Amino acid sequence: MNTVPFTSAPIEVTIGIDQYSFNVKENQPFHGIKDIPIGHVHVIHFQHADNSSMRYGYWFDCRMGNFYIQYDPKDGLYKMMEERDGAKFENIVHNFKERQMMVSYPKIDEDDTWYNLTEFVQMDKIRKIVRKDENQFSYVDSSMTTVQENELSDPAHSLNYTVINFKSREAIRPGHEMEDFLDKSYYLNTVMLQGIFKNSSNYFGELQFAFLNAMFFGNYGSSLQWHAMIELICSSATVPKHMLDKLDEILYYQIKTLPEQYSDILLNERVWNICLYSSFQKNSLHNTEKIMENKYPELL
Amino acid sequence: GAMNSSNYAELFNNDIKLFVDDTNVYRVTVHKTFEGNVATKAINGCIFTLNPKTGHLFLKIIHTSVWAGQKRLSQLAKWKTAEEVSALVRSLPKEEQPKQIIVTRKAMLDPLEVHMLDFPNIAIRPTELRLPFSAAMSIDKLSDVVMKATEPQMVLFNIYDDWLDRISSYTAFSRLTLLLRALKTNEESAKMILLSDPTITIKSYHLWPSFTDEQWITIESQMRDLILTEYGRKYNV
Numbered sequence A: 001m002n003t004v005p006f007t008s009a010p011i012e013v014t015i016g017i018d019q020y021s022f023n024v025k026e027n028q029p030f031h032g033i034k035d036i037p038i039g040h041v042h043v044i045h046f047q048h049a050d051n052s053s054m055r056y057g058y059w060f061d062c063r064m065g066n067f068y069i070q071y072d073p074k075d076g077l078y079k080m081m082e083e084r085d086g087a088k089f090e091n092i093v094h095n096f097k098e099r100q101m102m103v104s105y106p107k108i109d110e111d112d113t114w115y116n117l118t119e120f121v122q123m124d125k126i127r128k129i130v131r132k133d134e135n136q137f138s139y140v141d142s143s144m145t146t147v148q149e150n151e152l153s154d155p156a157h158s159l160n161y162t163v164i165n166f167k168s169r170e171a172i173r174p175g176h177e178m179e180d181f182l183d184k185s186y187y188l189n190t191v192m193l194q195g196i197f198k199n200s201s202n203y204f205g206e207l208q209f210a211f212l213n214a215m216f217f218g219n220y221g222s223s224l225q226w227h228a229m230i231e232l233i234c235s236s237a238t239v240p241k242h243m244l245d246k247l248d249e250i251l252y253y254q255i256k257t258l259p260e261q262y263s264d265i266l267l268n269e270r271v272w273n274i275c276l277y278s279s280f281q282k283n284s285l286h287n288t289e290k291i292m293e294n295k296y297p298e299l300l
Numbered sequence B: 001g002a003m004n005s006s007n008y009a010e011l012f013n014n015d016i017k018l019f020v021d022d023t024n025v026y027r028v029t030v031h032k033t034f035e036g037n038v039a040t041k042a043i044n045g046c047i048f049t050l051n052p053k054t055g056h057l058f059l060k061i062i063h064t065s066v067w068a069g070q071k072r073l074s075q076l077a078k079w080k081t082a083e084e085v086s087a088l089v090r091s092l093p094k095e096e097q098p099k100q101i102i103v104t105r106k107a108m109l110d111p112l113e114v115h116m117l118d119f120p121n122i123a124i125r126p127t128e129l130r131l132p133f134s135a136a137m138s139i140d141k142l143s144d145v146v147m148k149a150t151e152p153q154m155v156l157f158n159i160y161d162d163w164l165d166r167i168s169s170y171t172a173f174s175r176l177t178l179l180l181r182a183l184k185t186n187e188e189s190a191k192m193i194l195l196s197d198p199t200i201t202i203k204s205y206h207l208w209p210s211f212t213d214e215q216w217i218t219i220e221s222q223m224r225d226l227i228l229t230e231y232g233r234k235y236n237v
């Protein structure tokens, strides 16, 4: 069980760690979150009380180092940093633990929600979308745009998601124009799976990461990428059966975890209705269709 | 964006463009089978690709053979249309390729867009206008060549005959669209009008009678009457 200690909490802030959130009052005695399950990637995210604008936070894996949060009063935010001296970090953590100045990651023992949302996310892979190689953790906020978004301004601060464009020469073989546009299996299986990702795990991992940036940060470019990667499978007549069954689990937990009052924006009517009711795979997403209809039947 | 009433004059500026109409590409007669079911028999079709500035009609005849063994023919038709227009553009020298192609039905944008990925600088545009190019098969010479064709074939006609020698392209396009609108609302009347006077002949290399300026005025008026009229007999007004 690992720990993200906080030097202090100078400003009133809502802190989120994965799907959990809590309020910290300005200068409340608060020195972090303990008992974080090892073996998954995690996100710690922030929304200031005073400016609900800008959600931001940090993807991280405790197996990759000792990380802590110190507020920076110059730049105005809770920064993640690495402590290189293990002994001194352990000692600081221990005193905070003994004074009980830390909240506890509530690992429900029946609950596999976070595992199911991050099964294919990795920190070596996360750093290929968010580029900042001097740190082992990755910052994301609501305003970061994607590479493709920039094609349609600062490249260093972009989300380098895998560019998907259904009306592109990448997507469309000369001579198969109608074939490849109406059945996207060549682009899914040959260009994307075999060519770029190498395997469906990699495809699923970017899809999972895309959704989680959408939900936690309201990152529009990620929402766009999540839906694009869904739509590419849903629009391929030919998808390995294992990939379909896994996609149905993946979306099920995505839809189950979405806040009820945010579905109106983070869910694209056209893509979902197409995916569930018109596309090749309109019959392959039983769990996802069942929960969508029992929970968000308005969108459809 | 879309072409409409407000940007009508752009058709007659000096940027090359083409109208594509696909409404006559897939044509059928619907009939009954021996068992009393209904089946279709395809007949030859055409694509209507028109430079509104010069009058040039690049008529691609669509021979019923292209459908043989194919499914979802109304959907293939749009793609086949798109394939043929892109081929025509590829065939043209660069200084003769359109800068814009305006499709008369929105369902043609994605097919044409995909077929023209190699031409990113050609704008593919819908229109809000209810243009009457569907009636191009009411022009006898046009209809004749399509129905006689035994193989795929591209046929060329100036849809303006020699009008440009006397009137502007704007005026020529308006005449054409009034002629075609009349033909679409009442083909019989429309044609009776065009041919009532046996002394006005249609030249071998023209689609329309050799009216004088003053005979065109009369003609153009009678066509307006028809379109209003039928709009009465169609709305009891």
Ligand SMILES: CC(=O)NCc1cccc(Br)c1
Binding pocket: A005, A006, A007, A068, A069, A083, A088, A089, A092
């Ligand atoms: C402030 C200092 O002595 N070191 C930074 C730091 C290290 C580890 C945990 C925390 Br919380 C702060």
Ligand SMILES: CC(=O)NCc1cccc(Br)c1
Binding pocket: A017, A020, A021, A022, A033, A103, A104, A105, A106
């Ligand atoms: C939602 C739930 O079970 N607990 C919320 C929570 C409160 C405080 C700290 C943390 Br970590 C999580």
Ligand SMILES: CC(=O)NCc1cccc(Br)c1
Binding pocket: A120, A121, A122, A125, A126, A128, A129, A197, A201, A202, A203, A205, A206, A209
């Ligand atoms: C290099 C790359 O983006 N691969 C896909 C990917 C796999 C796993 C997790 C993530 Br996040 C992205």
Ligand SMILES: CC(=O)NCc1cccc(Br)c1
Binding pocket: B055, B056, B057, B058, B156, B157, B158
């Ligand atoms: C339709 C018509 O009379 N066109 C003139 C013409 C002839 C030959 C090539 C081209 Br481009 C246009």
